[PDB]
Design a binder for these strands. Structure first.
Ligand SMILES: Nc1ccn([C@H]2C[C@H](O)[C@@H](COP(=O)(O)OP(=O)(O)OP(=O)(O)O)O2)c(=O)n1
Ligand SMILES: [Mg+2]
Lengths: 328, 122, 111, 111, 110, 111
RNA sequence: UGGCUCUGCCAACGCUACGGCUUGGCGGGCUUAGGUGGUCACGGUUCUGUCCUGCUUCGGCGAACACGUUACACGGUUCGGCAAAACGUCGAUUACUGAAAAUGGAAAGGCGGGGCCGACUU
RNA sequence: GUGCCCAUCACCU
RNA sequence: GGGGCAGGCUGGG
């Protein structure tokens, strides 16, 4: 937008923004000690926060770091509500000046692009192009390997406001190698960072059929030797430039199915992943033999959304035949 | 910054009140819709509805189970008011749907009050 | 000190809120009367607190301040007619916070 | 005994219509009668959350006061009098609640 | 016994309620508070009778005392005259009768 | 008691005229002030019978609240109702009943 | 919000300190977001059935009944044409201005499709 | 803990 | 032999 971006801390601390940040920070969290301790004197709190940020005396409280295994062994660092609000107030001004440079085909944490617009992009870009092959790659330990330093050489060709820059650097120090997972600020800066590899695919490398979702990057081809090149070029880039090791890669013919984003996406069908099925099958079965066949309708409705995309007609018939419950 | 602290921070009082605020936010509009006649019923209903917040709040700060049971009595009376405003009020006051919605909200506050009574009772 | 100071600081709350609470339309008349009884009746809570030093009395002074902040939230929420503008809640919360601080220090001094 | 509330709720259902009827003229009496009538529910409720006979006697006092209100509202004069019928045909309803309250007092008293 | 006192206090109410409805709107808060003292003492008696703690029988006395205060207050409240001195005299006689019964009752319990 | 009330009657007789001068606008403040003023008599009286010092301190709180009302009506009420002189004169009368309340507190907590 | 410590008038429950007050009519005055769930980015051991045990570009991907792994049919995941503009991005926190880019500041151009225009469907 | 979707619930445009 | 599914049994909860 003329480039520049040189006065964002004025908009970040506009009361009308911090109130948006407040409502965004509290959205869903309204039964938490953080909201409820803040809610007390909410607008006096935001007036001391507005004026901490507007002074340059905001200092991020320490990340309360727990970890869950139920999704996957994580390393979830939470923040205090004040801190998530500062993050939300940054990421209301700063996010849309990054997420606008994000090439179309990055599907992660950006409004109006999701998991599901990605699988669809992929299928679609699989149907058109009549892709014969495809490179799927993935970044080793992505967030725990993001430079926090060549990140701030991207958070810094765009922020240009030397105070947003210093708030960005409070909320996320400019030294180390680990963007914290469980920060709004960090979902953004990881898309941005992995945006660098999108701009070594689409820009350099002239790859026009790809999709990246945060750390996973599908790259449909037609010559499997070219896609192997692309991959070597991507890995060399993301290793030398971004300090990202590529954990798994493959260059499969489109036939193995692209295990992308929870689905297995052939041109034609889009089976979901067996894990999902088995988890669901088991979840249902459990719910039945727990007498919890009413929260199962909630779960079922949920999983009927995750699977309305997938070609889960047969499987929905099958689950209706096994337990009777109204899947779709 | 450290959010402006109240003294005697009680999670349960804070949570209950935020959830009861939803009862009020549902019921206050329909307590204000009760006609001019049925004004005394309304004022008494509003004093029950808006005044339960004080019951919860005082329960929170003065940790005494007596005050928690008083909060329960108030929720019980609020449930009475729903019955009354539905049945005994003649124009309408509260549509059957509204009682069903309100009772759900009051039930949520009921749950939380119950849990809170229990955690204190131990 | 303590009770005298708290009350002089709370007088500023009253002096800010009483005007606001007298403006609340008759439609929201029960809310108003109850808000006024909360606002002008917190003085009694403070007064009783500094006539005993029973620390429960300064906790029910805190409860009253808490209820007063509820009233601010509530009066800002009521959208029939309308009452406390969001700004008024902000300003009031600052004043109540100052009384809150003093109550806190007083609770601590007794502790 | 929560049939108490549900047998009282027909006292309310009988008396409330004619209590809303009491003119502004008799407005304090009305407010106080309505607070007696609709507020006896709280007296019962508190009794049932405790089963202390004190609270049960308070419920009885309230029924007694409600009986007073009937006799008072009778001779309030002018076309606003609770008609003698209604005094008697509510005394019947209150008596039914009275019986149950009595049995409840007794059940508690002879544990 | 509660029944006797209340029937005798009903005479207070029956005398004073008319008079307490005549108190001018100017003295409207005093009036509503006097009416709430007057019809309202019945509850004090009734609670005293349907229970027993003797504090309740004192609270009934306090209420009668407050009612006596209201009479003296309303008599010469301002230029809008609320209660005529005669009315206070007549009312005080009736309140005195219920006073006597309350006294005897306090004594019988004591 | 008897003498406290006769001395407080003088407060009422001074303040009630002042409380009736508060404009309609501040009508809720007036009703609340009058309920403080005229309702302190009940506080004194109930202590008179039930001599428990608890009841006596509530009387003191009420006098204290009445002193707050003087402060409030002189300034915080925006057309400052009570003139500063009136607060001074009222405070003298309240002080006299304060003295008697103090002596009475002392007579009760002799041991 | 059955208001008004509010007036004019008229009555009469009444009450009067005889002035009124009250009370009743009768006019006027004042009066999408949120909540709650739930997807996607607990195992350990032997046992009993039951089934699978392929592929590989050597990274890995699978498989073991969702069984036609697929409602074998598509989602506007459509098909063309463009890419001027706007958007994005590099040019660039550059040229320039000015002591200093200092919370000034371009562009030509290059690259995109994210955009545009139709068709057909939505 | 963070976001994206799904369901359901209120609640008016 | 390894592997997936559903049940054995034991922890987490
Ligand atoms: N419960 C989770 C799981 C993941 N993420 C975020 C941060 C992750 O870095 C990112 C990508 O998810 P991955 O499943 O690929 O996990 P990693 O990036 O850490 O690498 P790997 O899967 O190889 O361990 O999504 C999250 O916020 N919350
Ligand atoms: Mg990874």
């Amino acid at each position: 937008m003329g480039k520049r971006h040189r006065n964002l801390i004025d908009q970040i601390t506009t009361w009308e923004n911090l109130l948006d940040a407040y409502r965004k920070t509290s959205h869903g969290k309204r039964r938490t000690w953080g909201y409820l301790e803040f809610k007390e004197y909410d607008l006096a709190n935001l007036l001391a926060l507005q004026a901490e940020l507007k002074a340059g005396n905001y200092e991020r409280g320490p990340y309360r770091e727990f970890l869950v295994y139920e999704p996957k062994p994580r390393l979830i660092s939470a923040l205090e509500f004040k801190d998530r609000l500062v993050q939300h107030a940054l990421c209301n001004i700063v996010a849309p000046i990054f997420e606008a440079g994000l090439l179309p085909y990055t599907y992660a944490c950006r409004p109006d692009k999701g998991t599901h617009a990605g699988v669809c992009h992929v299928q679609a870009e699989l149907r058109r192009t009549r892709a014969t092959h495809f490179l799927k790659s993935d970044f080793s330990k992505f967030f725990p390997s993001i430079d926090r330093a060549a990140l701030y050489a991207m958070i810094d060709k765009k922020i240009h406001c030397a105070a947003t820059r210093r708030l960005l650097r409070v909320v996320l120090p400019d030294e180390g190698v680990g963007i914290p997972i469980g920060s709004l600020t960090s979902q953004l800066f990881a898309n941005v960072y992995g945006g660098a590899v999108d701009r070594l695919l689409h820009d350099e490398l002239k790859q026009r059929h790809w999709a990246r979702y945060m750390d996973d990057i599908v790259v449909l081809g037609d010559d499997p030797e070219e896609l192997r090149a692309v991959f070597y070029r991507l890995r060399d880039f993301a290793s030398e430039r971004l300090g990202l090791k590529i954990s798994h890669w493959q260059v499969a013919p489109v036939s193995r199915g692209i295990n992308f984003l929870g689905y297995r996406i052939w041109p034609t069908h889009k089976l979901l992943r067996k894990s999902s099925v088995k988890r669901a099958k088991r979840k249902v079965a459990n719910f039945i033999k727990h007498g919890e066949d009413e929260s199962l309708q909630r779960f079922l409705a949920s999983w009927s959304g995750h699977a309305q995309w997938a070609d889960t007609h047969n499987l929905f018939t099958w689950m209706e035949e096994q337990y009777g419950i109204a899947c779709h | 910054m450290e959010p402006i602290e109240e003294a005697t921070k009680c999670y349960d009082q804070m949570l209950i009140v935020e959830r009861y605020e939803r009862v009020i936010s549902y019921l206050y509009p329909i307590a204000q819709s009760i006609p001019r006649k049925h004004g005394v019923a309304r004022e008494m209903f509003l004093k029950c509805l808006l005044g339960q917040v004080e019951l919860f709040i005082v329960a929170g700060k003065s940790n005494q189970v007596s005050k928690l049971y008083a909060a329960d009595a108030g929720l019980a009376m609020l449930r009475f008011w729903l019955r009354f405003l539905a049945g005994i009020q003649k124009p309408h006051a509260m549509t059957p749907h509204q009682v069903e919605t309100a009772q759900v909200l009051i039930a949520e506050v009921g749950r939380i009050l119950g849990s809170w009574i229990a955690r204190v009772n131990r």
